[PDB]
Design a binder for this molecule. Structure first.
Ligand SMILES: CC1=C(O)/C(=C\N=C2/C=C(C(=O)O)C[C@@H](O)[C@@H]2O)C(COP(=O)(O)O)=CN1
Ligand SMILES: Cc1ncc(COP(=O)(O)O)c(C=O)c1O
Lengths: 425, 418
């Protein structure tokens, strides 16, 4: 059984899962035996349609052979030597072609690593130390950015961090231009970087308000602060060239992962030659014995090569998302359950609202959205859905990540499963 | 050409390599086209015997099919879902079986990640903040440990670190029991952890002095400080159960990577249930979307499964190292070049000179410009090792007698050109 098999896992993995968040993501136990397309198989041989999809990398679904095969070939030809390799130029060139604001990169194993070195690059380059974040925006778990009352409160996110960890890190509310302007008027000249999820995906899928990214680019440019887009989720997802392209605003540095490597552990950060100058001279720092290994860069080449070869991909993904959005709206409407749904392409939040919530609200930030949401009922809904054979994360603020494997028929099954689950609510 | 192909790489990879250290590791350009066994193939189709081997993971050489095949099978069956998986228990159990001081683990993508979370666990568990390191010991590049690289001076290792990064990190010289005793007599009660390379591999291969690890275990135990063995390099390398087993001293936490995943990006940290209690309750923190992904844990299961099935492996690896050691000594003796060589199994340091117990003592004997010159010459003869004398060689089962005999010839020829 799932529950018994999870208990077995817990006797050797402290907490049941390596990541503290993802260990609370299966309150009705589910242990995977295999996966393909958008389908999981249980250790009880149950089939589950996955709307979470391993948190963003799988644009084409699980077990994508066009990418498996390339990575497996690399295992047969040397996957990790630590030396420069012919692939390094091909990976770099693909990223540069597809991403406007990137001409050079360095690779890492994870978004967390890529962010930490990107922030260091901004501090080293500007000779400043102060970094600005937004509430609910997640940039991995490195010591200077790991945050958990006002949105300007900076609260450490983990036990066992040094007390000064966040001394040079500051926070504002998402989509609050007045607050942002006031900050820059006071401290624009001390800011090394503003880091931001151009679309906030780790706390609902709150897109930026009209003009907000433009405003950020202006203030940062005027003040000499580097603008860092964390596109770990949005890159190669909301458009071929990420949110950068979709919203027509170019940052100084860009962090990438997820879709880039199709699920292989790999990330990068980069920008134009000017922003990357201290790394071109090897004066600034980045490291990691596995960084840019040959298997990882084969995965980038195969995945970005595949995406490049499909010039109408993002149009079809958009139809997929629209159809899921329309279907899920009908199912909740028919049941007379208020719901909030935000979508940017195949990135999608679905949250069940309180009976006392304003159905027509368009929250612009995490606090506004959280307040409308009925968390206990949503948790209860996802247990029910999981039993009906559909998995999404129990926290309403955690997004769904659709894929080309979520065809019309799949989405029609999802509808049925959600309908049945709501009736049990 | 190698040089032209590297220049192409540098137009899109800032600095030519993603890691700031490994971008200075090929001053005579070498770009890889393919690799297998202990052999590299150039973009000019040259063959090079690799003594560096990608910095530790490849105990059986490059392109190990018994491990390729398992990982490729995982790609066909779902490699990354973010959910608990049947493999998780098998990977955990294999580590627990092979490593004395580990009963539970969490996985990470890299030694740097695994270290950071391990140190946080020790701070959270003890309610203390102060961490002790040793000079020349490398624990990755996280904010609270990245030092440059007196022995007591704590110097930041990267530009753009917050100024307070190392405020709660302290350093002593390796193998200095007096200093270590004095530290603990004064501050034993404030120390959250002592982190240490049980064999110092990133600065020569300086093993611990007789009784030093035993002393560390006693002081940390007495003071309630967690002893953290960074076995990223030594684990499954110097013995099946790492330096832990080899030297009979058990730490509170162990960090693992490298050999564990056979070159797949994967790491872990773990200990006995007591030391891992705040992670069992999910009160302490670790994260990363790719942590413990199915491909990574398939690699751990295949690699550790293979090692487990070969109970005399570490004895054969010892013969391999002895033969390399004896051969290299003869070649330098015959040429009348003084050399310092330290070895622990297949971990091996070879430095050209102008028994040190620490980095300062060893560095002082070494002729760095001549060693750099020697490695350019060796590389041209078809043997690659890192140009810095303090960076170790990582031998493998693919370094057979014939290979080592070729290495001898190539080193002889290179010394004559010195
Ligand atoms: C925008 C963004 C992220 O979303 C991000 C990681 N996000 C997630 C990590 C989770 C985890 O570690 O278990 C789980 C997911 O819920 C989440 O999106 C990271 C950190 O990446 P990584 O997990 O590879 O360290 C950086 N930037
Ligand atoms: C002992 C030790 N620990 C940790 C690391 C860091 O692991 P990674 O390079 O995967 O971050 C290294 C790299 O040289 C190492 O030698």
């Amino acid at each position: 059984t799932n529950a018994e098999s999870l208990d077995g896992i817990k006797s050797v993995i402290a907490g049941g899962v390596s990541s503290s968040m993802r260990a609370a993501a299966v309150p009705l136990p589910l242990v995977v035996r295999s996966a393909g397309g958008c389908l999981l198989r249980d250790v009880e041989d149950g089939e589950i349609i996955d709307l979470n999809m391993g948190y963003g990398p799988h644009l084409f679904g699980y077990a994508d052979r066009e990418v498996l095969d390339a990575v497996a070939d690399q295992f047969a030809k040397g996957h990790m030597t630590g030396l420069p390799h012919e692939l390094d130029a091909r990976a770099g060139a693909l990223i540069a072609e597809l991403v406007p604001g990137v001409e050079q990169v360095r690779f890492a194993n994870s978004g967390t690593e890529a962010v930490a070195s990107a922030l260091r690059l901004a501090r080293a380059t500007t000779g400043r130390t102060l970094v600005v974040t937004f509430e609910g925006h997640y940039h991995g778990w490195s010591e200077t950015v790991l945050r958990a009352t006002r949105p300007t409160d900076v609260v450490p996110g983990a036990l066992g961090m040094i007390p000064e960890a966040l001394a040079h890190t500051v926070q504002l509310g998402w989509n609050d231009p007045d607050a942002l302007r006031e900050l820059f008027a006071r401290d624009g000249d001390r800011i090394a970087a503003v880091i931001v999820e151009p679309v906030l995906a780790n706390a609902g899928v709150i897109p930026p308000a009209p003009g907000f990214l433009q405003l950020l680019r202006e203030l940062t440019g005027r003040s000499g602060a580097m603008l860092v887009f964390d596109e770990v989720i949005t890159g190669f997802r909301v458009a071929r060239g990420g949110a950068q392209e979709r919203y027509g605003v170019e940052p100084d540095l860009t962090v990438l992962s997820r879709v880039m490597g199709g699920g292989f552990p790999v990330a990068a950060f980069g920008g134009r030659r000017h922003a990357m100058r201290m790394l071109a001279s090897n004066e600034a720092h980045h490291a990691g014995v596995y960084a840019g290994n040959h298997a990882a860069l084969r995965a980038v080449v195969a995945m970005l090569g595949k995406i490049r070869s499909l010039p109408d991909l993002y149009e079809r993904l958009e139809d997929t998302g629209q159809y899921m959005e329309d279907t899920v709206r009908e199912v909740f409407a028919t049941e007379k359950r208020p719901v909030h749904i935000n979508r940017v392409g195949t990135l999608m939040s679905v949250a069940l609202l309180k009976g006392s919530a304003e159905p027509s609200a368009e929250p612009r930030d995490l606090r506004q959205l959280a307040a409308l949401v009925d968390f206990p009922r949503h948790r209860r809904l996802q247990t029910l859905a999981q039993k009906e054979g559909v998995y999404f994360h129990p926290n309403a603020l955690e997004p769904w990540f659709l894929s080309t494997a979520h065809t019309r028929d799949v989405i029609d099954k999802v509808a049925g499963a959600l309908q049945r689950s709501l009736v049990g609510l």
